[PDB]
Design a protein around this ligand. Structure first.
Ligand SMILES: CC(C)=CCN1c2cc(C)c(C)cc2N(C[C@H](O)[C@H](O)[C@H](O)COP(=O)(O)O)c2[nH]c(=O)[nH]c(=O)c21
Ligand SMILES: CC(C)=CCN1c2cc(C)c(C)cc2N(C[C@H](O)[C@H](O)[C@H](O)COP(=O)(O)O)c2[nH]c(=O)[nH]c(=O)c21
Ligand SMILES: CC(C)=CCN1c2cc(C)c(C)cc2N(C[C@H](O)[C@H](O)[C@H](O)COP(=O)(O)O)c2[nH]c(=O)[nH]c(=O)c21
Ligand SMILES: CC(C)=CCN1c2cc(C)c(C)cc2N(C[C@H](O)[C@H](O)[C@H](O)COP(=O)(O)O)c2[nH]c(=O)[nH]c(=O)c21
Ligand SMILES: CC(C)=CCN1c2cc(C)c(C)cc2N(C[C@H](O)[C@H](O)[C@H](O)COP(=O)(O)O)c2[nH]c(=O)[nH]c(=O)c21
Ligand SMILES: CC(C)=CCN1c2cc(C)c(C)cc2N(C[C@H](O)[C@H](O)[C@H](O)COP(=O)(O)O)c2[nH]c(=O)[nH]c(=O)c21
Ligand SMILES: CC(C)=CCN1c2cc(C)c(C)cc2N(C[C@H](O)[C@H](O)[C@H](O)COP(=O)(O)O)c2[nH]c(=O)[nH]c(=O)c21
Ligand SMILES: CC(C)=CCN1c2cc(C)c(C)cc2N(C[C@H](O)[C@H](O)[C@H](O)COP(=O)(O)O)c2[nH]c(=O)[nH]c(=O)c21
Ligand SMILES: [K+]
Ligand SMILES: [K+]
Ligand SMILES: [K+]
Ligand SMILES: [K+]
Ligand SMILES: [K+]
Ligand SMILES: [K+]
Ligand SMILES: [K+]
Ligand SMILES: [K+]
Lengths: 207, 207, 207, 207, 207, 207, 207, 207
């Protein structure tokens, strides 16, 4: 299989829960193991901007998402915000790629500064120290210079800053086509197969 | 009237022509005067990703857009890429706000470095030196550190970096609702009235 | 009216609650709408260093302050520390000026880094990204280089760093005259009329 | 009226007294109130490079300039170099815009470093801390890296660096036409009406 | 005795002469030797904002202050602004701590840049090169980025930036209680005993 | 002969063609060899702001300028914008000094960044790498921080930033006297004799 | 003749007047023209640390030094601290090399920041902008980081920082031999012949 | 006793061996314990520029210096350049102050970069990490920007950069008086009593 076997998928409190849920579903379809984390503010976002009724507590959540995505048993793990027992808290864990989708400006700040307030922030601190893939998907506008400085510091280290800024080059017709464009770019960054967005110019031999 | 009387609207070669066209229409409806500029690459984008058949030459373009938006006569000016006779080339021009929507990574580079290759880039060079409003709407993903450094330099000067990264908090149902979200944010940045996106929490008195 | 119609007034845990309360009263007298936020540590400060018995919960607080200042109904809103439903959480809100008076070194840190831990910090993150007025009133001594770096970053962006450092040039006779000096400077920064501190030299024509 | 009601006009010891005198006259014609300051070295410049015999002491100066410009009584104030009683010494003064025209390299240095040696330098220190308009008009060549660093620091804060570098695009025929070009640019920066330099391209609708 | 035997106390032209005079009195009561310097602008401040009629010339000043504080003979020295014969001009002097209370923004600038215009500025230049204690007590608001950069540079070297920003945690009832709070903090920084401000929490054993 | 035997004189699209033409004439009178380059935008400037009808193509241009200045045969070479065969394209060329007079903000940008878009920009890239004299004569106002950063980078390398900012100390009576002042400063920078501007103070022995 | 024909020699208030006087004598013996400037504090140094009774006023000074060095008539000019009529005030002056020997930390500060307080500081500002030789001879110990930063900025521009730090490699036997070592190094920096310090290793062919 | 009980005195290959030998003698007279290190190049300097015939090997050296200074038995230790067994190699050693007198530009480089090539360089690396006093006495002229950057980095950390730049304010009559001035400044930096240089102004009470 190309790309990582295990992804840590963290959802934080930016207005684009759609992207995290779509990504989780694609990752499940590509038979990857997902370690799923969600912040308190992301729960509010999902409750108010989606028609997904996500249970509050990690075990009920894990059962709900497993059902929602058609996952295999144990394919989606769910860890709470202070569960230091969980793999992402230590670099001695098995190698994961980590994606924060969507990434609030507060989580972006914490990763840039090393705050490690909760398991999402510590998981990203660990990704960085271990040189493991770390992809952040901010959704904010405008971006202030505070935001941009935090993104630049992290980009210069090797994190991938992938804004929820979908393109219009594959004839999008729906909200879902725009969500899929961003998800397709994430999966391309991770090295995981996807067929939602064609390979640009793959047919073009000359001119 | 609140906000600027004249907007310089430049469209460059990023994959989000939809946003520039929607903005142009809203600006026309709010009875503003638009000085409209478009790059060669933006013409290709519009030809391949929209169903707008925009004429090539400035006078035919001006007539086409005037018809497309229901504008008044002389309300939309069109200037070509080397028309140094046009108002945006000099700071002795009447005060405009400038928006580059969408803003390619190449145009973002040129504005950050002061390249002044064409009238769009010189117009933004002039906005900056005159302390006039300058809003850039990039659409790219990932953003590299090259992109982020150019955005940060310009943000620190006072330009507004407003990524085409629409939010999901007003129940979007279509591609057009996502385009309108970004346009609404642009108009809010400019200080121009809009009714596509409500004022968050305007009704909420306590809790 | 000169100056802003709505002020977001945040009180945080520095030893100068007197200044926030006096400002709130002046803003009420100038018929402005105040969106009032207070941190947990600021509640402790007010309980221990003032003779104001402020209720804990936002609705009781709102009623208490309305009475304390002689405000009109709905003139003072109160929002809790995780009330993301409130206007200051989103840049799509109506335009406010924001003042953090007093501004603890922890809140100053969070604004400088973009931490967005609570509604005060996110409100200031939003002020910055929207280019809306942001005034911070620190009260600490010494200022360490950590403090000074955070103040400088924010000043360079455009925030106003206004230390609770009153002057002695208008013959102060009481603690209240010193509190009013600082409040008068805040209101001058905001562009709001005040008659506590004369205009220096307004009578002086020559020498 | 558009633009500021009161301008602090400081003249310092660069070789372009012509520009300060012309500006003072235009400001008087536009019915603004001018708080006029001049350095010791600027007095030497004016005595040696102009045919204006300016009296030395502030009251005689004030009478002379009032006559020279046809000003109204009290329209031009004159303050000496250590007159800390004067409005520009304190940010509690009424809001002025400040222009240093011409701005010597020594005054540029002092403003950049915060030296506050005299009332001109303190007035600019106050403009900066209050976020009031500050325009510097250097006249030097070459500009060394010392000069350029001081200009850049101040530009990045928000001061306007407007070199006495007139353009040739409005058919200048005399020394006075070149002086007026620079003055027209200053007044445009301040937002004050002027009819010496047309609005570039105002007639041009297309091409 | 704890703390330094000799303090160089410089008063400069910020609006807080009260703090310098109170400090001088406390230092006298703690039987320290004070080398007292005052700027021209500080003399104006003291004449206009206090009821202390300080003589102009150093010997008459020295006699006046000796009387004002109840000092012993030779306990207070006074040196003029160009008295390079005085101890603070050379690092070969006996070890002093230096406090600039209050510290104008101009003196802060000069110390940060090394200007050495007068004996106060050279005395602080010498403190720094000798690694002797240097405490600056600014009183200004807002602080601009010029001010903040100068404070940060000096803080990073090891100077103590102690703003005249008194706290409200010891139940202040008068102007004098606020002045004493700042003075108490200065003396704590210097390591000199004081009983105006208790040791916070000294009684608190647990919770 | 003092100063360089060959000057590369590049004219770019800033509003001060007068200075480049006057310099070219003085260089011809001092029997130097000039390698003359002009940009497309500079041709527009010269056509609209002067009464010089300069032919478009390099050979006709060369004949025209030779006649205009009274030059000797082969004394003025003209090279087109993509003529990489010309000496300034390679550092293996004979040693020239280079002057860009006037220097647009776009050419200033390109030299600062190393863009090498055309022969002028590559010629300056080569001057820098070879440590050959490079003088830039910008004419713009205001100078933005973009402009100032590009000027500072180049000044710090060793380029001379000489703004078209003439002085008034030699009693100028006409537009030509102001043009000559700037040209005289250029020639002084190059080390080439000139008698338009006296040596300041050459007669003054004491006081 | 090798090296410059005219030297501007400025003496400022550091404890090494011996070096400036010795240099002045050597420059006179090498038949150079010296434009001699001295600060107020340097006069105090020379009065207290040497047996040279230097007259106060420029004309009497000029006569005294001419006699002291055996100079030719007009070979030494003397200019006062505000004599802007003198050649060093303008870059349009004839080309000089400038040496500040000794260079106080205050003069070093002023040159680094561009303060231009007096003719010495402006003369060095002009040397820098004209790319003329500028040699500073500090005498201080320790050097603080303020001193070192100012020296580094100026060194990076191209000034020569030549500390009064004589070496012991030519068998010094007296105070004068140490003074001559430093003077010999200055003259070597300037390119002026000297026979006080041999050329190291000039005889050594191998090993 | 005031000041440190043990000094690590390192001599490196700059031309001022006189200062290290004089310091060693003064330290011996003040009954301190000296851990003495010398580089290979410093041995050459001492052999060629002094009349001290220092033995090559550490034990013979130790006996020679003990005799030369009249030291007590065990008062001077000598350690070779690779003697990692010696106290200065480890921060677990007893607390020393370290002086590198004279400090070559190569040793200054190594300390600034952390090279730790030999025991002198490691000893200074250890002083820094332990926050123990570190004084460097360079003797070079000019100082290049390489030298100045290394000095500034180390000064900013807390090392004392004390150039062998003696002053002339105590009437020096011989080479030895200049050597003693520098040594006196070193001892003052260390806090060790000395009577070679009086306390400046200690007698001066007023003026
Ligand atoms: C407010 C409105 C209507 C839009 C903003 N949107 C958002 C929606 C909702 C419905 C909530 C609730 C919160 C936001 N925020 C703010 C954000 O969650 C917080 O700053 C928060 O402290 C983040 O903590 P975490 O990093 O998730 O631990 C937030 N943050 C952000 O970076 N991007 C967003 O789109 C939005
Ligand atoms: C390629 C494809 C399929 C997607 C990228 N998209 C884009 C679409 C199309 C259909 C074209 C043609 C070009 C782009 N580009 C590249 C871009 O236009 C260029 O770098 C170009 O030189 C820009 O010049 P201007 O600044 O407009 O003068 C570009 N640039 C960018 O910043 N964002 C984009 O979305 C896209
Ligand atoms: C301790 C004493 C006696 C004085 C300090 N004073 C203060 C008084 C009291 C009585 C309390 C309780 C707390 C402080 N603090 C510390 C401060 O509140 C905290 O660091 C805190 O986490 C701030 O969080 P917020 O930003 O308000 O969310 C604090 N912070 C600060 O910046 N300035 C202060 O004056 C004081
Ligand atoms: C010398 C000659 C012939 C030309 C330079 N010109 C000038 C002319 C005259 C005729 C005088 C007298 C002085 C100058 N200066 C220098 C300048 O005034 C000073 O450095 C001075 O200390 C400035 O203090 P201020 O900032 O005014 O308080 C100066 N400074 C500057 O920045 N630009 C100039 O054009 C000139
Ligand atoms: C103006 C008014 C009403 C308030 C400002 N206040 C002040 C009061 C008075 C009554 C005087 C006269 C001067 C000030 N200043 C300005 C200041 O003294 C100067 O910039 C000055 O050149 C300082 O030089 P020194 O550093 O003392 O040598 C000054 N500077 C500053 O840093 N803080 C202040 O509070 C005030
Ligand atoms: C617009 C008007 C009325 C005034 C500005 N003036 C100017 C006049 C004219 C009449 C033209 C046509 C162009 C300018 N420009 C802009 C400039 O030429 C361009 O940015 C351009 O791309 C430069 O490319 P080059 O570096 O020459 O290759 C330009 N650029 C600049 O740096 N300074 C100027 O004075 C002016
Ligand atoms: C104090 C004593 C005993 C030694 C210090 N020495 C010196 C001696 C004398 C006998 C005087 C009087 C002054 C000094 N100074 C200080 C210095 O002159 C000043 O800071 C001053 O303002 C300099 O202004 P200028 O740059 O000359 O315009 C000064 N400055 C400096 O950089 N190096 C020195 O050696 C000394
Ligand atoms: C050459 C001559 C005649 C004068 C220079 N003087 C010196 C004298 C002698 C007589 C010798 C032999 C060497 C120097 N040096 C160079 C220096 O010792 C070296 O760069 C060397 O590698 C230093 O290594 P260490 O740091 O001691 O381990 C050196 N280095 C330096 O920083 N200052 C000096 O004064 C001198
Ligand atoms: K959480
Ligand atoms: K184009
Ligand atoms: K809280
Ligand atoms: K003055
Ligand atoms: K003074
Ligand atoms: K071209
Ligand atoms: K002087
Ligand atoms: K060695």
């Amino acid at each position: 299989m190309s790309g990582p076997e295990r992804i840590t998928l963290a959802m934080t409190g930016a207005s684009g829960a759609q992207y995290g849920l779509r990504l989780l579903d694609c990752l499940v379809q590509e038979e990857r193991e997902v370690h799923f984390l969600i912040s308190k503010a992301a729960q509010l976002v999902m409750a108010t901007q989606t028609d997904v009724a996500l249970p509050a507590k990690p075990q009920a959540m894990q059962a709900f998402l497993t059902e929602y995505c058609g996952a295999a048993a144990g394919q989606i793990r769910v860890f709470g915000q202070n569960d230091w027992m969980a793999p992402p808290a230590s670099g001695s864990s098995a190698p994961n790629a980590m994606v924060i989708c969507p990434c609030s400006t507060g989580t972006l700040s914490a990763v840039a500064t090393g705050a490690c307030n909760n398991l999402i922030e510590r998981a990203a601190d660990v990704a960085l120290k271990e040189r493991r893939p770390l992809v952040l998907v901010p959704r904010e506008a405008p971006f202030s210079s505070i935001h941009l400085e935090n993104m630049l510091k992290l980009s210069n280290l090797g994190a991938v800053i992938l804004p929820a800024a979908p393109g219009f080059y594959h004839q999008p017709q729906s909200v879902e086509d725009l969500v899929d464009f961003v998800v397709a770019r994430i999966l391309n960054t991770l090295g995981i197969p996807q067929d939602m967005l064609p390979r640009w110019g793959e047919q073009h031999l000359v001119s």
